[PDB]
């Protein structure tokens, strides 16, 4: 805290509580007693533990009918209206589409849509699987995931 | 018909003004004006103007016959105090409070 190290007043005789710094935390405009520093909150997740958690999540999705395994998922042009039409036809509103070859048109068409996220099979994350209501997976992606997780 | 007049920020401590106010509480406006006229206090001057203003308000705005008006409610609220510094001996300072007051006089037939 900006200020000087001058003792505000003498130690004895004034009748006031002893002071030593205008920057004391007991004082208005003083420093924070245990001021914060930039922190890193990253935790270590064992590779096995991470992969094991993924397998548990994938399993629940199957048991709860939250994994729509389709052979092919694509759009003719990078147009939002197209994907919106397709998703209503499939009857899925909130869905995480995992594809083997993240299609560029599919990436663009779903960009604006907020309840739809298109990721490759190598970009799946645990929270996204649990967050989105449905997890559409292309035939390619399912094999890739099984092989990656093995 | 309760017409009210108020002298806000009136320079004078509430304690002092309250002395005069207690005199005219519940007294006919006429009797009040006389009591204020012959009360040797600065607050009497302050109160009289507020009392006169209230009477004038009742007549001009509420068309109330002055003969019937009486001091239904009179009270003095403490106002904002002006903080001042009074030097003392040996370099010591003693803050001075310039206490103001809010004088509210209410007049009504009933």
């Amino acid at each position: 805290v900006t200020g000087s190290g001058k003792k505000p007043w003498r130690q004895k005789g004034t009748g006031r509580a002893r002071s030593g710094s205008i920057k004391s935390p007991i004082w208005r405009s003083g420093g924070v007693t245990f001021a914060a520093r930039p922190q890193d909150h990253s935790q270590k997740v064992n590779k096995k533990m991470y992969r094991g958690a993924l397998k548990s999540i994938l399993s629940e999705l199957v048991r709860q009918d939250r994994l729509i395994v389709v052979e092919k998922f694509s759009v003719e042009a990078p147009k939002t209206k197209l994907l919106a039409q397709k998703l209503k036809d499939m009857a899925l509103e909130d869905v995480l589409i995992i594809t083997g070859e993240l299609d560029e048109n599919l990436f663009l068409a779903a960009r604006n849509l907020h309840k739809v996220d298109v990721r490759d099979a190598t970009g799946i994350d645990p929270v996204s699987l649990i967050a989105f209501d449905k997890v559409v997976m292309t035939a390619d992606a399912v094999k890739q995931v099984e092989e990656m997780l093995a | 018909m309760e017409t009210i007049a108020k002298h806000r920020h009136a320079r004078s401590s509430a304690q002092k003004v309250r002395l005069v106010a207690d005199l005219i509480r519940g007294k006919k406006v006429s009797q009040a004006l006389d009591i204020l006229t012959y009360t040797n206090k600065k607050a009497a001057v302050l109160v009289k103007k507020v009392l006169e203003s209230a009477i004038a308000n009742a007549e001009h705005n509420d068309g109330a016959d002055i003969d019937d008006l009486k001091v239904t409610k009179i009270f003095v609220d403490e106002g904002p105090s002006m903080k001042r510094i009074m030097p003392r001996a040996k370099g010591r300072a003693d803050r001075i409070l310039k206490r103001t007051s809010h004088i509210t006089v209410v007049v009504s037939d009933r």
Binding site: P8, W9, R10, T14, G15, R16 | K90, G91, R92
Partner: peptide, 19 residues
């Protein structure tokens, strides 16, 4: 809140010395 205290000023009486 309280203001900054004054430095030693002249004192009216000697402190009694107890001894």
């Amino acid at each position: 809140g309280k203001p900054r205290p004054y430095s030693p000023r002249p004192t009216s009486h000697p402190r009694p010395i107890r001894v």
